[PDB]
Design an enzyme around this catalytic site. Structure first.
Site, short mmCIF file in Angstrom:
data_model
loop_
_atom_site.label_atom_id
_atom_site.label_comp_id
_atom_site.label_asym_id
_atom_site.label_seq_id
_atom_site.Cartn_x
_atom_site.Cartn_y
_atom_site.Cartn_z
N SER B 205 0.81 -1.21 0.00
CA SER B 205 0.00 0.00 0.00
C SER B 205 0.85 1.27 0.00
O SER B 205 2.00 1.28 0.46
CB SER B 205 -0.93 0.01 1.21
OG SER B 205 -1.77 -1.13 1.22
N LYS B 227 -8.98 -1.74 12.62
CA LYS B 227 -9.22 -0.38 12.17
C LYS B 227 -10.40 -0.35 11.20
O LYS B 227 -11.21 0.59 11.21
CB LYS B 227 -7.97 0.21 11.50
CG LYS B 227 -8.11 1.71 11.21
CD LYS B 227 -6.80 2.40 10.82
CE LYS B 227 -6.96 3.93 10.82
NZ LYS B 227 -5.68 4.67 10.59
N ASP B 228 -10.52 -1.40 10.39
CA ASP B 228 -11.59 -1.49 9.40
C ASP B 228 -12.95 -1.86 9.96
O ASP B 228 -13.95 -1.27 9.57
CB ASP B 228 -11.19 -2.45 8.29
CG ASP B 228 -10.05 -1.90 7.45
OD1 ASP B 228 -9.62 -2.58 6.51
OD2 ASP B 228 -9.58 -0.78 7.74
N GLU B 271 -30.38 10.26 -10.80
CA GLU B 271 -30.04 10.11 -9.39
C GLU B 271 -28.73 10.89 -9.15
O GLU B 271 -27.90 11.02 -10.05
CB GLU B 271 -29.87 8.63 -9.06
CG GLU B 271 -30.08 8.28 -7.59
CD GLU B 271 -31.25 7.34 -7.37
OE1 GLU B 271 -32.38 7.69 -7.79
OE2 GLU B 271 -31.03 6.25 -6.78
C1 HEM Z 1 -15.40 -1.98 -6.85
C2 HEM Z 1 -14.26 -1.07 -7.03
C3 HEM Z 1 -13.31 -0.97 -6.06
C4 HEM Z 1 -13.09 -1.67 -4.86
C5 HEM Z 1 -14.01 -2.63 -4.07
C6 HEM Z 1 -11.69 -1.32 -4.48
C7 HEM Z 1 -11.01 -1.84 -3.41
C8 HEM Z 1 -9.74 -1.51 -3.08
C9 HEM Z 1 -9.06 -2.03 -1.96
C10 HEM Z 1 -9.52 -3.15 -1.02
C11 HEM Z 1 -7.92 -1.38 -1.89
C12 HEM Z 1 -6.88 -1.50 -0.78
C13 HEM Z 1 -7.09 -0.64 0.46
C14 HEM Z 1 -7.16 0.85 0.14
O1 HEM Z 1 -6.12 1.45 -0.21
O2 HEM Z 1 -8.28 1.41 0.23
C15 HEM Z 1 -7.81 -0.63 -3.07
C16 HEM Z 1 -6.73 0.12 -3.38
C17 HEM Z 1 -6.65 0.99 -4.44
N1 HEM Z 1 -7.68 1.23 -5.32
FE1 HEM Z 1 -9.42 0.47 -5.30
N2 HEM Z 1 -11.16 -0.35 -5.34
C18 HEM Z 1 -12.20 -0.08 -6.21
C19 HEM Z 1 -12.19 0.92 -7.12
C20 HEM Z 1 -11.15 1.73 -7.35
C21 HEM Z 1 -11.30 2.88 -8.18
C22 HEM Z 1 -12.57 3.27 -8.98
C23 HEM Z 1 -10.07 3.50 -8.15
C24 HEM Z 1 -9.73 4.67 -8.83
C25 HEM Z 1 -9.74 4.79 -10.37
C26 HEM Z 1 -9.23 2.65 -7.34
C27 HEM Z 1 -7.91 2.86 -7.13
C28 HEM Z 1 -7.17 2.20 -6.18
C29 HEM Z 1 -5.81 2.52 -5.86
C30 HEM Z 1 -4.97 3.64 -6.47
C31 HEM Z 1 -5.50 1.81 -4.75
C32 HEM Z 1 -4.21 2.01 -4.02
C33 HEM Z 1 -4.40 2.33 -2.57
C34 HEM Z 1 -3.21 3.05 -2.03
O3 HEM Z 1 -2.97 4.18 -2.51
O4 HEM Z 1 -2.51 2.50 -1.16
N3 HEM Z 1 -9.94 1.65 -6.73
N4 HEM Z 1 -8.96 -0.62 -3.77
C1 ICX Z 2 -29.14 5.42 -11.71
O1 ICX Z 2 -29.71 5.61 -13.00
C2 ICX Z 2 -29.97 6.90 -13.34
O2 ICX Z 2 -29.77 7.89 -12.66
C3 ICX Z 2 -30.56 6.91 -14.71
N1 ICX Z 2 -31.70 7.78 -14.73
C4 ICX Z 2 -31.68 9.03 -15.25
O3 ICX Z 2 -30.70 9.57 -15.76
C5 ICX Z 2 -33.02 9.65 -15.14
C6 ICX Z 2 -33.17 10.84 -16.04
C7 ICX Z 2 -32.98 10.51 -17.49
C8 ICX Z 2 -32.54 11.68 -18.30
C9 ICX Z 2 -31.31 12.11 -18.59
N2 ICX Z 2 -30.15 11.53 -18.18
C10 ICX Z 2 -28.92 11.95 -18.68
O4 ICX Z 2 -28.82 12.87 -19.50
C11 ICX Z 2 -27.68 11.24 -18.18
C12 ICX Z 2 -26.43 11.48 -18.84
C13 ICX Z 2 -25.23 10.83 -18.41
C14 ICX Z 2 -25.25 9.92 -17.31
C15 ICX Z 2 -24.00 9.17 -16.81
C16 ICX Z 2 -23.92 7.78 -17.36
C17 ICX Z 2 -23.43 7.55 -18.67
C18 ICX Z 2 -23.38 6.23 -19.21
C19 ICX Z 2 -23.82 5.15 -18.42
I1 ICX Z 2 -23.75 3.21 -19.18
C20 ICX Z 2 -24.29 5.38 -17.12
C21 ICX Z 2 -24.35 6.68 -16.61
C22 ICX Z 2 -26.51 9.68 -16.66
C23 ICX Z 2 -27.71 10.33 -17.08
#
Ligand code: HEM
Ligand code: ICX
Ligand code: PEE
Ligand code: PEE
Ligand code: HEC
Ligand code: HEM
Ligand code: BOG
Ligand code: BOG
Lengths: 100, 379, 49, 241, 59, 49, 79, 67, 54
Positions: B205, B227-228, B271
């Protein structure tokens, strides 16, 4: 002029890595060059850098800093690595331009 | 041999990734979201199945099945609540989990990051389809607008949409195949989550100070397992507090009206977790522009790792960057709000600006402040 | 839709060369008081009001 | 009408995060629905059995449900036949389909009132004001023939004729059937009708908050307790010299 | 000393520690439920069907 | 040398019952643990429920 | 899968710590805890709050300006 | 013949300054508009402002008197 | 498919009759199951004979 010089000092106190006792070059991110440099450090200078960090880390974990009187002061900050690094980099720059 | 916790081809794993795992003695609370996200996923899936066991994907019964599930199934109602909101709590957590990464530059662990991105993308998609199942007015009109987004691509455009709907306009075939999608995607998330975590374990990490930590590490257990468990209960309280005391706060009520392919509601908002996107898509007055801006509004994350110019890893020691970071956060908060508002003055212009500023802080102000900063340290 | 003259003429006199889809109000209708179309916003599909 | 008037915030007896519905105002509200709204408004997701243990006794409901003739069948010849209602039936539709209703209300469709309380921005607060707030159009406003004015309704031209007026019915519990007293009870009913759990939902909430308070603290201990070791820790660098 | 007697006959033997959480939780539930139910039925006096019940329950 | 080394002062953090360097820490153990263990044991009950 | 032992080379560092059972749950809540909780808050509120406040403003303006544009201007009806 | 606590308090409130102040603004709007045809103006706004202040008031008391 | 007694049966036929290549797609699924069990059966026998069960 004496602007960049009164600016730098500010920024330095601003970044505040001194509060942790860390020298300017203690906070350097360790890419490949740095790594290399650090290995070239004289036995001691390294063992010293080590402590400072393992101590800073201990701080960040406790959430505290050093009492005001132990902080590094802009002018007493030793750039113990800057020279070794510029050499690594200088060295590398060569190998690279030579491969053409 | 010796102990049966390091030689068992299975038990070794729970012990090689959850107990003896070396962790910086100092990671904060912004590192907790990792687990939560996981617990979040596994949890959604449970309420999810439980639910899917009563839903009926078919326009003429979608809406009514969800109500029957709430009204007639034992604790059904509760079970929906937890699922419906878990989604939010989910998006919340993921959001910090991303900010945490930005601030402390975890994004230097490229692979661990990129996967993250993919993960986000999937979650986003996942929630989209889930939301359509209850076949409400939004469900519909949402399903109708979102898919329509692909119609922006030229040639394979209008045509790609057809698969999606499985028709010439949203109808049953769409609903049923969405239910399939929704049922499936989560598992894919759980799968990629495995790659995500597995990549992370090659490097260990990151940590708040942005410097080597080998000089002092501690066993995930019991330091971070404890901690978690705490972190979980601190976040679980509000989420339960909403889903038990104000179920519909975060939810639009318009979706309590059975879809009507003939009347698009006047006050249409997606949403919350999609507003910022919404705002950007609405900022550019052009089918394609809006889409593109949108597409990049998120796809930009892939670039963050190549837009790092500071000689240090975390912002902890770069006040300038810090201020710029918080400016970005707030910048986002606005964009969201803007999405919550109709297309009118001042909103239109405010939206337009905030977007420009969003993209600009990421593409130019961060790399620029980053460099400057170095020169002020004398590097 | 039943359009009154209070509107039918108003829609005839508008810079026909600065739309996005260049067209005159006459090539779309047979008899002006009756405008007819498929209520689907070309943007992303909602029923225009 | 780019402009709209929003409703106020009445202190419903059950508004509080620990406040159960007024199981009496609900029993009444019902009567109001049964004797007034159920002539134009459907209640498809509610059924006589739901009342039991909440507003009516088992015996009452049976009778209640028997006051209606429902369409069961086919029989043995294959004919649909009418039969008395059982507790298991849902509240009867006043029309056979939206097409019909519209025709009997001037093209206007009086929406099913099961989830109505949760489908309009404002909920019971809005539904109350719409009912009571009916009035005359201000200067410069002409309301199409068949439509009545209502400042609270969007567009202010509502196709629903003001449904209530003092004594329009008479509660069996001996309560002053004033316009509002009814509108209060019916709005209160709609809530129950819209989310019957309501009560058991808040009861749990409490329980949750209590465990969640206790348990969160109990863990703040065990997290620190273990961590203490690293927080109290002290280190020193002692080179050779 | 309760804590000592506690630590000796309960929290020590991992076997009895558990046996306690069990017989323990048991009581806790039984008790907790009652309280919350009471704290609730009390905050909503005369509004619950359990309160109105006798006005129609022919008895 | 390994002689010029001594454990610093952990009085700021010591539990009151073992703050005096002249009283056996073994009498006041039964408690120190019974307690932390009671917190623990309880939490376990809270969870269970 | 083993990382403990191959980490880094450290020399001359002594560390002392005490059993949890020997030390306090949470100590010096007032002589040390809070006074630090503050410091932190202090040092950071000046990088964080600014832009947030900056937003708040913009939100209210935008909102207030919108509700304002809904009202009617007499100068169009005094004719 | 009984009195709906509503109409009783709807009276009482129309006395609060806020009410009258807006009540008057309307009275005036109503006048200039009713006495002129080939207009555009409408007294909705003024009305709302009124109903708004009025009812808001009604809201604080009404429920005390209702059962 | 549409899991619901009053439409279960019919959905499968609609899938066969109206879905492009649906019919084929069912067939493959329907029988794959068998082919599946066949394979698994030898895969077990193979195991029994050569004692892979050790
Ligand atoms: C379902 C999606 C995800 C889950 C369940 C998840 C889970 C985790 C877990 C368990 C860790 C290790 C503990 C921590 O550092 O928090 C981790 C680390 C990490 N995750 Fe995710 N992650 C997810 C999505 C993402 C997303 C969307 C990003 C950003 C684009 C991301 C970037 C990272 C990075 C950079 C680390 C390194 C942690 C550090 O800096 O030490 N994760 N993730
Ligand atoms: C949780 O679901 C919602 O909120 C969907 N419902 C709605 O957006 C209700 C209103 C509908 C009208 C307009 N919506 C948008 O213009 C709209 C535009 C971009 C996004 C983000 C997104 C993109 C691809 C993709 I793949 C996903 C998201 C989400 C919504
Ligand atoms: C996206 C859609 C919009 C959603 C809106 C998100 C919700 C907004 C709520 C704001 C979150 C509250 C954060 C306040 C925390 C204040 C604080 O403590 O900041 C200072 C503190 C100082 O730490 P150090 O410098 O390391 O000190 C060393 C030890 N002494 O900084 C931190 O805690 C680290 C910052 C992590 C928080 C990030 C969360 C913000 C979320 C936004 C998502 C942004 C990313 C872009 C997404 C693109 C899609
Ligand atoms: C009527 C009610 C009946 C209930 C029946 C359930 C019975 C279950 C009881 C199991 C027995 C528990 C005993 C565990 C023994 C392990 C042990 O040694 O102690 C616990 C041991 C710690 O070790 P020591 O404190 O050093 O103990 C030393 C003993 N001399 O492990 C722990 O830390 C336990 C506490 C962690 C709790 C984690 C849970 C927090 C999560 C909360 C979310 C809420 C729950 C939702 C669950 C959903 C499930 C689908
Ligand atoms: C005379 C038939 C009739 C009766 C009886 C009646 N309503 Fe309605 N109601 C309607 C109509 C018509 C509408 C639809 C208005 C429109 O959309 O133009 C309507 C709509 C509604 C709406 C709001 C619709 C919206 O879009 O906000 C509510 C709420 C409502 N009625 C409540 C009641 C209540 C409560 C009662 C019983 C106490 C009642 N109605 C009795 C005819 C009636
Ligand atoms: C990946 C995590 C999940 C997320 C992010 C999620 C999100 C959602 C969303 C947004 C809705 C609409 C909720 C609403 O009606 O307000 C929903 C509905 C639904 N989801 Fe999920 N869901 C997840 C996983 C699943 C899984 C794993 C299943 C089971 C395969 C499932 C089954 C359902 C069912 C049955 C519905 C329809 C009934 C309902 O709306 O309550 N979901 N989900
Ligand atoms: C059970 C908890 C699993 C958490 C997900 C992380 C996986 O990844 C790691 O790769 C190594 C080499 O292949 C394996 O030996 C480890 O067991 C594995 O955890
Ligand atoms: C002897 C076994 C009887 C089992 C009866 C199951 C009926 C469930 O009864 C439950 O009682 C709770 C009391 O706190 C109420 O709050 C719930 O709403 C109710 O459903």
């Amino acid at each position: 002029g004496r602007l960049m010089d009164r600016i730098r000092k500010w920024y330095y106190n601003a970044a505040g890595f001194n509060k942790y006792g860390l020298m300017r070059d203690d906070t350097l991110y360790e890419d490949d060059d740095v790594k290399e440099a650090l290995k070239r450090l004289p036995k001691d200078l390294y063992n010293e850098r080590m402590f400072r960090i393992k101590r800073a880390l201990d701080l960040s974990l406790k959430h505290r800093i050093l009492p005001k009187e132990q902080w590094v002061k802009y002018e007493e900050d030793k750039p113990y690595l800057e020279p070794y690094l510029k050499e690594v980099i200088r060295e590398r720059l060569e190998r690279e331009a030579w491969n053409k | 041999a010796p102990n049966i916790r390091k030689s068992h081809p299975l038990l070794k794993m729970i012990n090689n990734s959850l107990i003896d795992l070396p962790a910086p003695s100092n990671i904060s609370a912004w590192w907790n979201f990792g687990s939560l996200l996981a617990v979040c996923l596994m949890t959604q899936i449970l309420t999810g199945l439980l639910l899917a066991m009563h839903y009926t994907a078919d326009t003429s019964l979608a809406f009514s099945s969800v109500a029957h599930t709430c009204r007639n199934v034992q604790y059904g109602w509760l079970i929906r609540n937890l699922h419906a909101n878990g989604a939010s709590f989910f998006f919340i957590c993921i959001f910090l989990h991303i900010g945490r990464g930005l601030y402390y530059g975890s994004y230097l662990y490229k692979e661990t990051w990129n996967t993250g991105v993919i993960l986000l993308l999937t979650l986003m998609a996942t929630a989209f389809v889930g939301y359509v199942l209850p076949w409400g007015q939004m469900s519909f009109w949402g399903a109708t607008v979102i898919t329509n987004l692909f119609s922006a691509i030229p040639y394979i455009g209008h045509t790609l949409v057809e698969w999606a709907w499985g028709g010439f306009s949203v109808d049953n075939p769409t609903l049923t195949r969405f239910f399939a999608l929704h049922f499936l995607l989560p598992f894919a998330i759980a799968g990629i989550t495995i790659i995500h975590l597995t990549f992370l374990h090659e490097s260990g990490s990151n940590n708040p100070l942005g410097i080597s930590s080998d000089s002092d590490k501690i066993p995930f257990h019991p330091y971070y397992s404890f901690k978690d468990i705490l972190g979980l209960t601190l976040m679980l309280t509000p989420f339960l507090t909403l889903a038990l005391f104000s179920p519909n706060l975060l939810g639009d009520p318009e979706n309590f009206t059975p879809a009507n392919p003939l009347v698009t509601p006047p006050h249409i908002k997606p949403e919350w977790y999609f507003l910022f996107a919404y705002a950007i898509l609405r900022s550019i007055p052009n089918k394609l522009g809006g889409v593109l801006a949108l597409a990049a509004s998120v796809l930009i994350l892939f670039l963050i790792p190549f837009l790092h110019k500071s000689k240090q890893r975390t912002m902890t020691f770069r006040p300038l960057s810090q201020t710029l970071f918080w400016l970005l956060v707030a910048n986002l908060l606005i964009l969201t709000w803007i999405g919550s508002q109709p297309v009118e003055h001042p909103f239109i212009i405010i939206g337009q600006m905030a977007s420009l500023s969003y993209f600009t802080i990421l593409l130019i102000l961060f790399p620029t402040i980053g460099t400057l900063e170095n020169k002020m340290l004398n590097y | 839709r039943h359009r009154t003259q209070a509107e039918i003429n108003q829609e005839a006199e508008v810079d026909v060369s600065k739309l996005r889809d260049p067209q005159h109000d006459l090539d779309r209708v047979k008899k002006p008081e009756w405008v007819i179309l498929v209520g689907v916003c070309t943007h992303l599909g909602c029923v225009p009001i | 009408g780019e402009l709209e008037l929003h409703p106020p915030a009445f202190p419903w007896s059950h508004g509080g995060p620990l406040s159960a519905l007024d199981h009496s105002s609900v029993r009444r509200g019902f009567q109001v629905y049964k004797q007034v709204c159920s002539a134009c408004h459907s209640m498809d997701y509610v059924a006589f059995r739901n009342l039991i243990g909440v507003t009516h006794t088992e015996a009452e409901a049976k009778a209640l449900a028997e006051e209606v003739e429902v369409q069961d069948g086919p029989d043995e010849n294959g004919e649909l036949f009418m039969r008395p209602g059982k507790i298991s039936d849902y509240f009867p539709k006043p029309y056979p389909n939206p097409e019909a209703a519209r025709a009997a209300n001037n093209g206007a469709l009086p929406p099913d009132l099961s989830y109505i309380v949760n489908a309009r921005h404002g909920g019971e607060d809005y539904v109350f004001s719409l009912l009571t707030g009916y009035c005359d159009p201000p200067a410069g406003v002409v309301v199409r023939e068949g439509l009545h004015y209502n400042p609270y309704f969007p567009g202010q031209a509502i196709g629903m004729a003001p449904p209530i007026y003092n004594e329009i019915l008479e509660y069996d519990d001996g309560t002053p059937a004033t316009m509002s007293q009814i509108a209060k009870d019916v709005c209160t009913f709609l809530r129950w009708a819209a989310e019957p759990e309501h009560d058991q939902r808040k009861r749990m909430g409490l329980k949750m908050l209590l465990i969640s308070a206790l348990l969160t603290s109990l863990l703040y201990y065990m997290k620190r307790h273990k961590w203490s070791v690293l927080k109290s820790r002290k280190m020193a660098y002692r080179p050779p010299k | 000393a309760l804590l000592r007697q506690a630590y000796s006959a309960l929290f020590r033997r991992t076997s009895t520690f558990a046996l306690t959480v069990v017989l323990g939780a048991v009581l806790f539930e039984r008790a907790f439920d009652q309280g919350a139910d009471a704290i609730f039925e009390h905050l909503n006096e005369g509004k619950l069907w359990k309160h109105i019940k006798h006005k129609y329950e022919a008895s | 040398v390994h002689n010029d080394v001594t454990v610093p002062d952990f009085s700021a953090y010591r539990r009151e019952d073992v703050m005096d360097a002249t009283t056996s820490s073994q009498t006041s153990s039964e408690d120190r643990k019974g307690f932390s263990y009671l917190v623990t044991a309880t939490a376990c009950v809270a969870t269970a429920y | 899968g083993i990382h403990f032992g191959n980490l880094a080379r450290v020399r001359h560092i002594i560390t002392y710590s005490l059993s949890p059972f020997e030390q306090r749950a949470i100590p010096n809540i007032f002589s040390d805890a809070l006074p630090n909780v503050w410091r932190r808050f202090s040092s950071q509120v000046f990088k964080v709050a600014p832009p947030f406040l900056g937003a708040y403003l913009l939100y209210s303006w935008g909102t207030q300006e919108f509700e304002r544009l809904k009202r009617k201007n007499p100068a169009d009806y005094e004719n | 013949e009984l009195v709906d606590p509503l109409t009783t308090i709807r009276e009482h409130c129309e006395q609060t300054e806020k009410c009258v102040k807006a009540r008057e603004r309307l009275e005036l709007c109503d006048a200039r508009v009713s006495s002129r045809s080939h207009t555009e103006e409408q007294c909705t706004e003024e009305l709302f402002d009124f109903l708004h202040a009025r009812d808001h008031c009604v809201a604080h008391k009404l429920f005390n008197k209702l059962k």
